[PDB]
Amino acid sequence: KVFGRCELAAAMKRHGLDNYRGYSLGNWVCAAKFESNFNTQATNRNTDGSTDYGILQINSRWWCNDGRTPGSRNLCNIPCSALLSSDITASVNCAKKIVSDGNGMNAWVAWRNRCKGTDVQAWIRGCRL
């Protein structure tokens, strides 16, 4: 599924991401935009053996288990294929864990590169929340 901007914002808000650990909703929508272009099936297979999965491109070394990545920690305790669902629940719950495990939103390069220091509110502006 390829989410719309406002549709994803609403879904992320229903799952409690707005202001989660001090990060406004627009930060999360912006991260998904530039990580995956809102595509729930996005994958990025890296040369280090790991793969980035789903709308928030969560990596298979630390966070999910795809069975083929060296050094797997599977800290979200989920198969990576679960992060490729049309429902964003698994990705949101793992994103929270990524932050709960001591990381900021710096854990998403696309967020640092394209969202940090910008008017992230624009990504929810005009939406029914």
Ligand SMILES: O[C@@H]1[C@@H](O)[C@@H](O)OC[C@H]1O
């Ligand atoms: O485990 C849950 C976590 O994934 C998230 O949803 O935040 C609340 C917790 O109950």
